[PDB]
Amino acid sequence: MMIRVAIGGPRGKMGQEAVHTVMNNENMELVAVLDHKDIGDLLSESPNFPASYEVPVFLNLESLIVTIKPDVFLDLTTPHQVFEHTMLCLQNNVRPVIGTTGFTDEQLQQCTILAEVNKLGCIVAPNFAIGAVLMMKFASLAAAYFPDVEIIEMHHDQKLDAPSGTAYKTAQMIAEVRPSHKQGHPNEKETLEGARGASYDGIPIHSVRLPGLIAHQQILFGGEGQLFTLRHDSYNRQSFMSGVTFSINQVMEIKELVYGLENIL
Amino acid sequence: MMIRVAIGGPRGKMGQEAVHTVMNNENMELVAVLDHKDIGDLLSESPNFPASYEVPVFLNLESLIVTIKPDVFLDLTTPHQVFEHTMLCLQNNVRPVIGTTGFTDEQLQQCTILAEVNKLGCIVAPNFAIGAVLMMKFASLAAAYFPDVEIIEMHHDQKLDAPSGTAYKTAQMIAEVRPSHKQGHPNEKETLEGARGASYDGIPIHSVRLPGLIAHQQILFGGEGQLFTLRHDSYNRQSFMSGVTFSINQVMEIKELVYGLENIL
Amino acid sequence: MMIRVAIGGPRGKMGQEAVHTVMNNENMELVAVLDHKDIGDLLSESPNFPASYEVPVFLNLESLIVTIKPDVFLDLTTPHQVFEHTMLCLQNNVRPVIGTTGFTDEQLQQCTILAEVNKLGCIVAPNFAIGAVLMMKFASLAAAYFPDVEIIEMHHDQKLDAPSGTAYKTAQMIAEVRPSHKQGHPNEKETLEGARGASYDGIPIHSVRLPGLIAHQQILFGGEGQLFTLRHDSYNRQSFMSGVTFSINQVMEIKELVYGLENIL
Amino acid sequence: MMIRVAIGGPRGKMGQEAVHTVMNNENMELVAVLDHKDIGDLLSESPNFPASYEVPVFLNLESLIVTIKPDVFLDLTTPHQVFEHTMLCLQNNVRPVIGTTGFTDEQLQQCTILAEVNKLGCIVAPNFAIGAVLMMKFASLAAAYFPDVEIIEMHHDQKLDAPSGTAYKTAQMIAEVRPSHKQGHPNEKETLEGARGASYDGIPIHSVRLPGLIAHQQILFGGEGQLFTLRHDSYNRQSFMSGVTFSINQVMEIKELVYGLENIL
Ligand SMILES: NC(=O)c1ccc[n+]([C@@H]2O[C@H](COP(=O)([O-])OP(=O)(O)OC[C@H]3O[C@@H](n4cnc5c(N)ncnc54)[C@H](OP(=O)(O)O)[C@@H]3O)[C@@H](O)[C@H]2O)c1
Ligand SMILES: NC(=O)c1ccc[n+]([C@@H]2O[C@H](COP(=O)([O-])OP(=O)(O)OC[C@H]3O[C@@H](n4cnc5c(N)ncnc54)[C@H](OP(=O)(O)O)[C@@H]3O)[C@@H](O)[C@H]2O)c1
Ligand SMILES: NC(=O)c1ccc[n+]([C@@H]2O[C@H](COP(=O)([O-])OP(=O)(O)OC[C@H]3O[C@@H](n4cnc5c(N)ncnc54)[C@H](OP(=O)(O)O)[C@@H]3O)[C@@H](O)[C@H]2O)c1
Ligand SMILES: NC(=O)c1ccc[n+]([C@@H]2O[C@H](COP(=O)([O-])OP(=O)(O)OC[C@H]3O[C@@H](n4cnc5c(N)ncnc54)[C@H](OP(=O)(O)O)[C@@H]3O)[C@@H](O)[C@H]2O)c1
Ligand SMILES: O=C(O)c1cccc(C(=O)O)n1
Ligand SMILES: O=C(O)c1cccc(C(=O)O)n1
Ligand SMILES: O=C(O)c1cccc(C(=O)O)n1
Ligand SMILES: O=C(O)c1cccc(C(=O)O)n1
């Protein structure tokens, strides 16, 4: 009755928290991890992990899957491998929960068709923090009243992808309600290239990468003589662990790909 | 077919904008104003108002009402008179739209029973700005996920009432979903009296009064390793005029008191 | 003993405030304005301006200067003409105060050499609001402690130039103290072009253009487990008028170009 | 040549970080800790601390001091004991570095006279984070331009003292430059008691206590049509450890009490 869980990227900043979270969830067993550095046969061979953590380490996902057959694979690796990892899972009977960001629209859609076809649950979560999920949800609603919006998204300066998964997802959600259009004066000029940020269906997105930050976003809706702002700030990686636990549990109940936890609160 | 509108406090910071707004609404006639300073027979006798504004001035509301019989009275006066003004209207066949803040819970409830009994529309709007209304609406929803919240509310330093009407209304709305409780360590001490702010069913409220501000609020919901924030900023009094126009129109369609525009977007 | 002042762009959002400000300064006479639309011989012929404002209108700056010989020309026009306007002034004996933004580094330096050579005062003010000036000043100082910084700069959506004059000036000031370097992970990728903003000596700058905004900036300095933020918000164009008055006065006391009011508080 | 350091409150949220920081500073030896719970003879007997941490535990400060004679005592305990602890140190030849908040003005002044008289260094640091120190420093300067200011100060909801040490110190600093006065309309009324916050020489202070927060402050200076804001956010307790290390080092160089690290950057 335990959910048998494998994790990708156990030594990472998210990885190790999720290792501990899964170790201490009483309805979940951590049955394996995937790395890409030889760090021994068992995760207990690493420092940062105690001797009790006799979890087998694999350097090859296909090997992990065939040897261990986990119910769920939680990916917290890098954008470079996210698609390949998810795909391997989805055609070898493993439910992926993907924390990792940096799918393409096309790859996400391909993953969605694979889950559909194999009747297999998958969660792609751009943010595990419940306040972030709430932010996104309210963005959809606010977009109805305020068609002009921008997104500013801020993270630690080791983050590899800009804009962030959350900002992409926010913008998609907004884009469904908001009529497509450009903002700013039609004749504005950027005299320093990049100033006005990225653009998603006309919605500007700006990305901040500084030391000290963890994960933050604000959504600014302009109106008549006023500004409505939605904001979320995660101050540490523990803010994500309830979402991770919720996602492992939730993925078992579905037979298709769910993109974003907003759908299933 | 015109809505016949009288306004209380026409020379005030809100008053004069609403005078202009009502003058330029094509489905509304400004049929009278109420002051408490002798400023002449007609509002056109005041500077700030053009010669075209031949709107009769009254210093007595009962006189105004009996002489003019407006469909609607828009009050933008002071907390000192708000109750008396609303009550006079509600038992002389006039729909009040009350911008003015500073009713007591008891007075609001008395006003609500009078409207009910006289089958007469009344809107009490703690904020006319649509982003503010949206803020309040989302506060209710957010309160379900985050029971610990505080409100910080900021206005120009001529404002007479603290906390603000909006902050009261926000807190009421939150209080319906949020279990009643105290926040902060149970043994915390205030060593400078007032630090921890006012309290509404355990919800702290803090009020900022500075030059330069117009009207602003933020709502801070604490959670695990994170903070979810809802914010609205009105940068001028024109931000309120769509709400005022919406309220005059909406009041004509109802036969009871509506508290807050959230109900009727 | 009156400062004889001419203004460029009198009907503009800044222009008209500055018209009124200069009209009501008792040590200043508004002796002319420059437009580029035929709006009559006198500014009093325009609506928005009262009959008392018998200020001659010119459509040609050289004509204005030769006819009127103002002590000072206050430019609040457009980036397209700023350089040409300043230059005409600086070689016809007129002190320019330039509110208008959008000089190039090269044009600014050319203007600085012209003022030097003609012993003629000139102020180029990227922001007239004293809190903005203070923000910039503190940015220099903060940069010593926190080498990693980003600038987010927000304005109404009729603004023509991005990034803003203030953000350029902020970055220049920072750049003098901050060692030149790139921020963000060295391998970060922008998967939506523009996300990470413009770059000034490695300092990111992001520009927000929404309805309802007037002028706003924040400066974010990342550090160990923390973030230091400097912020300024102008909520209307009156926030600039003390700076404008200060600049007209100050320009008379100098014999070279001053870039930014920080130098001369 | 090592600084011999004892710490009060080693198991606390600050305490344990400072234990690790001091253990890993190569010019410092942790020679003792003070608790008030019997947790064994050595700190290594506690979990959270490794076997290598053979640091003697004392339950009595006087005993600690006479037995160990540390150069420096770092207090991270509770407001209840702060004064007593500092005083014991200052008349038994030990330099106190006091992280703990909640001295009275009178107790602080008494401590300052004791240090003076015994020619003994003491640092009372209301914030160890360098951005906080910078915030305070800039507050003094900003106060010259903007006499109307409020302070909002936000911390986790286990914090015992409100307002915070930092907010007290900020206000003191401001109060030296700012003319003493009340803010807000002179006739404003609080209809919910506490709304307008605490008052320090007329300066309002508001205190927020929520889960998820660590330590945060903003300082809001109102002006003409504008607002200047100084802000600092500590996102974890590691943000304080450079300040702690700096303070142990700095205290050795002084022969009197220094209140706030602003003096000695
Ligand atoms: N959804 C959310 O709520 C959320 C929250 C936080 C982060 N994230 C995302 O999650 C990902 C992880 O972030 P992070 O900050 O934890 O990054 P991180 O600290 O870089 O950790 C990534 C880990 O994956 C390892 N790794 C890299 N390639 C691998 C492979 N092919 N197989 C196995 N392991 C591999 C890395 O090892 P080496 O260091 O040895 O390369 C590292 O231990 C990012 O994409 C980020 O955007 C999402
Ligand atoms: N719901 C919202 O969205 C919203 C927005 C803004 C303001 N408000 C509220 O609306 C009220 C007005 O704010 P404000 O800033 O406009 O205040 P204001 O500028 O003080 O204007 C109040 C006006 O009412 C006049 N007045 C006072 N007592 C009166 C009486 N008995 N009869 C007739 N006129 C009277 C005043 O004249 P004297 O100056 O001669 O006394 C003044 O012209 C306040 O309660 C405020 O909280 C609500
Ligand atoms: N330093 C500061 O503190 C500060 C503050 C605010 C704004 N600004 C800057 O000041 C400039 C003005 O901003 P704004 O919002 O006032 O713009 P605006 O409302 O567009 O006004 C510009 C005015 O200049 C007129 N104009 C354009 N070309 C002209 C020419 N060749 N000769 C004479 N008049 C001309 C325009 O008339 P038409 O509309 O007929 O073209 C308009 O009336 C911008 O560059 C902005 O960045 C600076
Ligand atoms: N200056 C700064 O930068 C800064 C930063 C953070 C915190 N602080 C301040 O530092 C203090 C500590 O904060 P915190 O969050 O670490 O509090 P904490 O987690 O409550 O820790 C206090 C520690 O002191 C212990 N303690 C209580 N009374 C004691 C006594 N008489 N002798 C020895 N130990 C005692 C407590 O043990 P029990 O739990 O067993 O009672 C606890 O382990 C607070 O006053 C806070 O305001 C200052
Ligand atoms: O939206 C995202 O991409 C995201 C969300 C939380 C954390 C991180 C991260 O640490 O990179 N990234
Ligand atoms: O909530 C309120 O009480 C409120 C809302 C907008 C403006 C004002 C005001 O100007 O006083 N007050
Ligand atoms: O820094 C700037 O460029 C600036 C500053 C204030 C106002 C404006 C504007 O309204 O465009 N622009
Ligand atoms: O100013 C203060 O009192 C302060 C500063 C940092 C942290 C804390 C705390 O955690 O209580 N308190």
mmCIF file of N, CA and C in Angstrom, chain A residues 212-257:
data_model
loop_
_atom_site.group_PDB
_atom_site.id
_atom_site.type_symbol
_atom_site.label_atom_id
_atom_site.label_comp_id
_atom_site.label_asym_id
_atom_site.label_seq_id
_atom_site.Cartn_x
_atom_site.Cartn_y
_atom_site.Cartn_z
ATOM 1 N N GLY A 212 20.743 35.283 -2.711
ATOM 2 C CA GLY A 212 19.865 35.500 -1.588
ATOM 3 C C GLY A 212 18.438 35.152 -1.831
ATOM 4 N N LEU A 213 17.937 35.421 -3.048
ATOM 5 C CA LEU A 213 16.559 35.012 -3.437
ATOM 6 C C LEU A 213 16.397 33.487 -3.410
ATOM 7 N N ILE A 214 15.181 33.028 -3.199
ATOM 8 C CA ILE A 214 14.805 31.650 -3.468
ATOM 9 C C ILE A 214 13.827 31.607 -4.620
ATOM 10 N N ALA A 215 12.560 31.945 -4.416
ATOM 11 C CA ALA A 215 11.622 31.944 -5.527
ATOM 12 C C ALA A 215 10.484 32.878 -5.266
ATOM 13 N N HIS A 216 10.199 33.730 -6.236
ATOM 14 C CA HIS A 216 9.336 34.890 -6.001
ATOM 15 C C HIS A 216 8.664 35.280 -7.290
ATOM 16 N N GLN A 217 7.436 35.772 -7.213
ATOM 17 C CA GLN A 217 6.837 36.319 -8.424
ATOM 18 C C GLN A 217 5.874 37.377 -8.042
ATOM 19 N N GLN A 218 5.738 38.340 -8.919
ATOM 20 C CA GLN A 218 4.662 39.280 -8.783
ATOM 21 C C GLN A 218 3.973 39.475 -10.119
ATOM 22 N N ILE A 219 2.690 39.757 -10.055
ATOM 23 C CA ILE A 219 1.886 39.894 -11.251
ATOM 24 C C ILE A 219 1.188 41.220 -11.067
ATOM 25 N N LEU A 220 1.428 42.122 -12.013
ATOM 26 C CA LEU A 220 1.006 43.513 -11.949
ATOM 27 C C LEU A 220 -0.036 43.794 -13.020
ATOM 28 N N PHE A 221 -1.228 44.190 -12.610
ATOM 29 C CA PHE A 221 -2.339 44.430 -13.521
ATOM 30 C C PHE A 221 -2.617 45.923 -13.495
ATOM 31 N N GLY A 222 -2.378 46.586 -14.586
ATOM 32 C CA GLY A 222 -2.633 48.020 -14.664
ATOM 33 C C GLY A 222 -4.097 48.304 -14.919
ATOM 34 N N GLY A 223 -4.622 49.379 -14.342
ATOM 35 C CA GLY A 223 -5.995 49.845 -14.610
ATOM 36 C C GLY A 223 -6.130 51.365 -14.501
ATOM 37 N N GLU A 224 -7.326 51.867 -14.343
ATOM 38 C CA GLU A 224 -7.560 53.330 -14.277
ATOM 39 C C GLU A 224 -7.121 53.890 -12.954
ATOM 40 N N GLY A 225 -6.058 54.679 -13.033
ATOM 41 C CA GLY A 225 -5.514 55.341 -11.880
ATOM 42 C C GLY A 225 -5.135 54.369 -10.782
ATOM 43 N N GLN A 226 -4.770 53.135 -11.129
ATOM 44 C CA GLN A 226 -4.559 52.099 -10.106
ATOM 45 C C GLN A 226 -3.758 50.892 -10.570
ATOM 46 N N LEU A 227 -3.329 50.088 -9.614
ATOM 47 C CA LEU A 227 -2.568 48.891 -9.901
ATOM 48 C C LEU A 227 -2.972 47.771 -8.917
ATOM 49 N N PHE A 228 -3.293 46.598 -9.456
ATOM 50 C CA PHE A 228 -3.642 45.448 -8.663
ATOM 51 C C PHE A 228 -2.489 44.476 -8.774
ATOM 52 N N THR A 229 -1.989 44.009 -7.633
ATOM 53 C CA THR A 229 -0.807 43.189 -7.620
ATOM 54 C C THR A 229 -1.029 41.868 -6.888
ATOM 55 N N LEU A 230 -0.606 40.763 -7.492
ATOM 56 C CA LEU A 230 -0.619 39.484 -6.843
ATOM 57 C C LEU A 230 0.820 39.123 -6.641
ATOM 58 N N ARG A 231 1.179 38.590 -5.477
ATOM 59 C CA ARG A 231 2.566 38.319 -5.151
ATOM 60 C C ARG A 231 2.693 37.031 -4.332
ATOM 61 N N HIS A 232 3.752 36.281 -4.596
ATOM 62 C CA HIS A 232 4.115 35.169 -3.751
ATOM 63 C C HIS A 232 5.633 35.163 -3.566
ATOM 64 N N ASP A 233 6.087 34.790 -2.354
ATOM 65 C CA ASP A 233 7.499 34.706 -1.989
ATOM 66 C C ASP A 233 7.718 33.364 -1.258
ATOM 67 N N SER A 234 8.541 32.480 -1.807
ATOM 68 C CA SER A 234 8.983 31.285 -1.069
ATOM 69 C C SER A 234 10.290 31.645 -0.455
ATOM 70 N N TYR A 235 10.438 31.441 0.835
ATOM 71 C CA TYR A 235 11.653 31.861 1.508
ATOM 72 C C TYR A 235 12.620 30.728 1.734
ATOM 73 N N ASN A 236 12.198 29.511 1.444
ATOM 74 C CA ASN A 236 13.122 28.398 1.527
ATOM 75 C C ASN A 236 12.555 27.222 0.759
ATOM 76 N N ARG A 237 13.328 26.163 0.665
ATOM 77 C CA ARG A 237 12.882 24.990 -0.122
ATOM 78 C C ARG A 237 11.919 24.075 0.622
ATOM 79 N N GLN A 238 11.893 24.137 1.947
ATOM 80 C CA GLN A 238 10.789 23.498 2.693
ATOM 81 C C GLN A 238 9.396 23.950 2.302
ATOM 82 N N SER A 239 9.247 25.145 1.719
ATOM 83 C CA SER A 239 7.935 25.619 1.285
ATOM 84 C C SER A 239 7.335 24.755 0.187
ATOM 85 N N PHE A 240 8.208 23.991 -0.467
ATOM 86 C CA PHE A 240 7.782 23.123 -1.544
ATOM 87 C C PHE A 240 7.394 21.722 -1.162
ATOM 88 N N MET A 241 7.708 21.284 0.045
ATOM 89 C CA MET A 241 7.603 19.847 0.380
ATOM 90 C C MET A 241 6.190 19.314 0.597
ATOM 91 N N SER A 242 5.275 20.140 1.082
ATOM 92 C CA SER A 242 3.874 19.761 1.103
ATOM 93 C C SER A 242 3.345 19.542 -0.295
ATOM 94 N N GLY A 243 3.768 20.374 -1.250
ATOM 95 C CA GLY A 243 3.317 20.243 -2.633
ATOM 96 C C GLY A 243 3.855 18.963 -3.253
ATOM 97 N N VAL A 244 5.080 18.623 -2.926
ATOM 98 C CA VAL A 244 5.698 17.432 -3.469
ATOM 99 C C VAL A 244 4.946 16.202 -2.988
ATOM 100 N N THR A 245 4.670 16.179 -1.688
ATOM 101 C CA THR A 245 3.922 15.073 -1.046
ATOM 102 C C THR A 245 2.518 14.967 -1.634
ATOM 103 N N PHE A 246 1.850 16.104 -1.768
ATOM 104 C CA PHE A 246 0.529 16.167 -2.403
ATOM 105 C C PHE A 246 0.561 15.636 -3.827
ATOM 106 N N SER A 247 1.620 15.956 -4.570
ATOM 107 C CA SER A 247 1.748 15.532 -5.967
ATOM 108 C C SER A 247 1.986 14.030 -6.128
ATOM 109 N N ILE A 248 2.775 13.423 -5.250
ATOM 110 C CA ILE A 248 2.997 11.992 -5.317
ATOM 111 C C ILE A 248 1.671 11.289 -5.063
ATOM 112 N N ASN A 249 0.978 11.725 -4.020
ATOM 113 C CA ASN A 249 -0.306 11.161 -3.705
ATOM 114 C C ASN A 249 -1.264 11.347 -4.899
ATOM 115 N N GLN A 250 -1.367 12.569 -5.404
ATOM 116 C CA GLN A 250 -2.373 12.891 -6.449
ATOM 117 C C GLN A 250 -2.146 12.192 -7.771
ATOM 118 N N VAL A 251 -0.896 11.955 -8.111
ATOM 119 C CA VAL A 251 -0.578 11.358 -9.385
ATOM 120 C C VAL A 251 -1.150 9.932 -9.493
ATOM 121 N N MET A 252 -1.249 9.255 -8.351
ATOM 122 C CA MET A 252 -1.764 7.890 -8.282
ATOM 123 C C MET A 252 -3.232 7.808 -8.627
ATOM 124 N N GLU A 253 -3.938 8.933 -8.525
ATOM 125 C CA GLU A 253 -5.357 8.964 -8.756
ATOM 126 C C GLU A 253 -5.701 9.335 -10.140
ATOM 127 N N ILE A 254 -4.743 9.602 -11.004
ATOM 128 C CA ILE A 254 -5.094 10.073 -12.340
ATOM 129 C C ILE A 254 -4.514 9.174 -13.406
ATOM 130 N N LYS A 255 -5.049 9.318 -14.615
ATOM 131 C CA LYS A 255 -4.722 8.466 -15.741
ATOM 132 C C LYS A 255 -4.409 9.285 -16.991
ATOM 133 N N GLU A 256 -3.918 10.493 -16.778
ATOM 134 C CA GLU A 256 -3.559 11.402 -17.827
ATOM 135 C C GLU A 256 -2.565 12.402 -17.218
ATOM 136 N N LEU A 257 -2.068 13.335 -18.031
ATOM 137 C CA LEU A 257 -1.136 14.330 -17.567
ATOM 138 C C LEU A 257 -1.886 15.531 -17.041
#
